[PDB]
Design a protein around this ligand. Structure first.
Ligand code: LZ1
Length: 218
């Protein structure tokens, strides 16, 4: 199947990405606390629901939250300010809190059931968010011997996410608060800049955007 692209809300960031975030791929954003990773996730969860000529995929969303940072009212605000019904947009986000890394891994396997259910509806799942991908792994696997064990478990988790992305034509979007190896398709470094701006760079030009009542924008 042909790749789809989801606008981030920022023309600058969209250009950096080659046209938006891709289905059949895992895009990882990483950066320090406060760099805007979760705001970008909230914005994408709205943008994907737009029709294709407006930068979306007529898609639904699955969101796995490891830090209790999902904010339904932020979704509703972004949606309303972009002309979408806030309650319809929120209804199309399936939401789950992951309690630990083993639960997080099960939830990805569990997500396949809803993906299959919605696959031939008018709003199939097109975006799967894991925010944060790494927080539970970092807290649980620590000390001598943990590097190999943590990386091996993360590799399996990412393999599961790659399979869902590739098999069901979904964009997987993951966040990472930051010499270790990484298995995401594309890695985007986010940081704070001057004037409240955020700056994004591809890892392995730079886009600049603001966090606004519309989520993110130029
Ligand atoms: C991941 C994210 C959201 C979800 N809702 N139901 C199952 C599930 C898995």
């Amino acid at each position: 199947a042909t790749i789809g692209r989801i606008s981030t809300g920022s023309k600058s960031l969209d250009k950096l990405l080659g046209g938006g975030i891709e289905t059949q791929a895992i895009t990882e954003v990483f950066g320090e606390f406060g760099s805007g990773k979760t705001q970008l996730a909230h914005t994408l969860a709205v943008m994907v629901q737009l029709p294709p000529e407006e930068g979306g995929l007529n898609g639904s969303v699955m969101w796995i939250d490891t830090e209790n940072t999902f904010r339904p009212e932020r979704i509703r605000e972004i949606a309303q300010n972009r002309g979408l019904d806030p309650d319809e947009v929120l209804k199309h986000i399936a939401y789950a809190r992951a309690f630990n890394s083993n639960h997080q891994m099960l939830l990805v396997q569990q997500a396949e059931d809803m993906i299959k259910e919605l696959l031939n509806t008018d709003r199939p799942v097109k975006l799967l968010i894991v925010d944060s991908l790494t927080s539970h792994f970092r807290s649980e696997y620590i000390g001598r011997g943990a590097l190999a064990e943590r990386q091996q478990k993360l590799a399996k988790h990412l393999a599961d996410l790659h399979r869902l992305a590739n098999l069901y034509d979904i964009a997987v979007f993951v966040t990472n608060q930051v010499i270790l190896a990484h298995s995401a398709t594309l890695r985007v470094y986010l940081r704070k800049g001057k004037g409240g701006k955020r700056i994004a760079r591809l890892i392995d030009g730079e886009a600049v955007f603001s966090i606004t009542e519309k989520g993110i924008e130029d």
